[PDB]
Design a binder for these strands. Sequence first.
RNA 1: UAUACCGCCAUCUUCAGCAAACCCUGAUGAAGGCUACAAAGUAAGCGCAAGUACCCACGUAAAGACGUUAGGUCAAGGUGUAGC
Lengths: 217, 322, 132
Amino acid sequence: FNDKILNEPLKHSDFFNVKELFSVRSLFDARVHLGHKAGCRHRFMEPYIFGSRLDHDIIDLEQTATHLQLALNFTAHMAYRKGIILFISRNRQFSYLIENMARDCGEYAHTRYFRGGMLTNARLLFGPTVRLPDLIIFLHTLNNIFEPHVAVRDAAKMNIPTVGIVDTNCNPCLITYPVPGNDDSPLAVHLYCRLFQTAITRAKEKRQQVEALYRLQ
Amino acid sequence: SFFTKLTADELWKGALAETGLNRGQIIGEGRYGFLWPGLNVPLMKVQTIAQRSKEEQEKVEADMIQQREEWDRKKKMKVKRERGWSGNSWGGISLGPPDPGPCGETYEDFDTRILEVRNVFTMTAKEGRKKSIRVLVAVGNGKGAAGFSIGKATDRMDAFRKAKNRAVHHLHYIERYEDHTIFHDISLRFKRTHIKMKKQPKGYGLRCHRAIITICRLIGIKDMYAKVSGSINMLSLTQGLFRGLSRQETHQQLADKKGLHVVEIREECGPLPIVVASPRGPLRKDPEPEDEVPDVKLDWEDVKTAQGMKRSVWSNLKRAAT
Amino acid sequence: KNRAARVRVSKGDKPVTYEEAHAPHYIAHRKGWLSLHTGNLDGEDHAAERTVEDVFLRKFMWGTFPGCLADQLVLKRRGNQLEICAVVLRQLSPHKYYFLVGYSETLLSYFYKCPVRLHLQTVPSKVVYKYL
RNA sequence: UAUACCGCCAUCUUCAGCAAACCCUGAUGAAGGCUACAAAGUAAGCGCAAGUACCCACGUAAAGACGUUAGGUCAAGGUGUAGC
Ligand SMILES: [Mg+2]
Ligand SMILES: [Mg+2]
Ligand SMILES: [Mg+2]
Ligand SMILES: [Mg+2]
Ligand SMILES: [Mg+2]
Ligand SMILES: [Mg+2]
Ligand SMILES: [Zn+2]
């Protein structure tokens, strides 16, 4: 019996200090604006991409920062309501780092081979009463093969607020809160993982503080 | 002889031949006219030893034969089966509602309505022509909640319930304005099925395909004219109708996008104009570009109906009731 | 295609009992021996008569108990008798069961001059073992 | 009357698949669902497998699954119609 959880967090912009978690200069230091070639670039990814440097796409960091703020606020509000987050990755370039981050965070992850529809038929494959993932964060939307991951399809079929760092190949229209930017460099991935971890930790701390404030009564 | 005696289920299976029980004969009451302390008398409370005449036993056997005949007659009891569209067919027939979910989701409110049935014969490596069946069922009570589905299999009830579950997992919604008529007209061209709908008022009548009539009854639309142009493909026609219903411009959204109010001069009422929708913030003070003689590609059927030039042996004849 | 006692599969929904769910070659591996008599030795007489009596008593007990048998019978021999171990299906009342048992016992005793006392094992549901 | 069956047996069978219940795809068509440096397939159930006997678990024994052959049998018993 605590209806204040549906009004207190959703009131002030950046309740958990979302914009302060990252920085425009810190993001630019990772060279996330870089992208693939125009040929590899996707059609629907044109509005989010700014220009090109000798066929090297550049993404305006302002829209990326706005999308990151939105996604971080969404994830913090979800954690405030106690929800499951699922990390996806298949490039095998930083799988160990993503696993360590998932271990540090208070959620689950799955960056390995995704069998044929594990979330759709979760009634029979998984347990009958399983808390399905309420959020998805893509660490590498592009798997080993040049093919859009099925996670977006399962989400659209299950209606889940999808999050992730879309590259210049996938379809951001299928993702709810896309985040244009590089998805290959190491410093960028490390910064994104650290930002997600800090956001989750601060959201949990604020949730505990609000619970204590409620208990003060 | 005794060697010529075996079970009875085997003999029954043999007599039936479908390849390429002791009810009347009581076990308690002796088949020979006799009385005993056990049964047929006060259950041990006048416990004696008597005997019935053979005529009484023959009468008891005749009574058992009459009971068998009564059971056989009961087996001949007829039943009521509503005819769907075509006589003795599962056209526009209805059945029970879909089953709930595991944790809940009482989907019993929705109503099922089988549409078409087709027997497909596809040869195989050894089984031969597989008697596969494909069905397209549409479930939905109304108020926008509805949706079609498909469920092919080599059975009947199994395929029906599979299609019902698929429809439950595939619920389509259609933005409506006053449950009676669609927002505006639609002139689509789904693959090879044309859909020419016309906005009509209440009490006008359902002038559309029987399948479309059932779809509208399930959705909620009461009456609306529709010219079923092009070929008559059930699956493609239904898919195109669903696509058109999903692609519709509402009044509130259109007003919010453009800004201008909805001006109208209804003939039923007086010249008093009544706004139907208003913007959600701004208001385009400038009027629309009233450019006369616009480029609205109307249909020839519209002109034929407005000028009454359409004439045939089946133009606008009286149709059935209900 | 030989099809002795082994049942041909068709769909995984065949409520077969325990004894019925066994091939006819597992008599020395999984399946035991139902009826027993010295006639099947190397070599003792009294075989044809024993087999005939067993086959007759099986059908007799199956007819006297219409549908009240969860599975096949298991004959035995102890003295001048023929014990019959059966898994009766709880169908009729115990009074009727006792009456029929006594009647059959007396009839067999006065007919074959051999008190063929049987044994029951009331079980409501059939002992389903596999879904062939 | 077995080219109407129960029941029985024979080749393929020198084989490896056969399927209930689900999910995805083909602008949602009859239909297909395989790529482990992994692209949608999960698969209780039957069988191969597996397991068990003489001299072991080997050699010898039991099984050779769904199905073509309307495979043969009124000829071991009854058996859809007819009749002496
Ligand atoms: Mg008719
Ligand atoms: Mg023959
Ligand atoms: Mg062979
Ligand atoms: Mg063998
Ligand atoms: Mg065997
Ligand atoms: Mg022949
Ligand atoms: Zn990309």
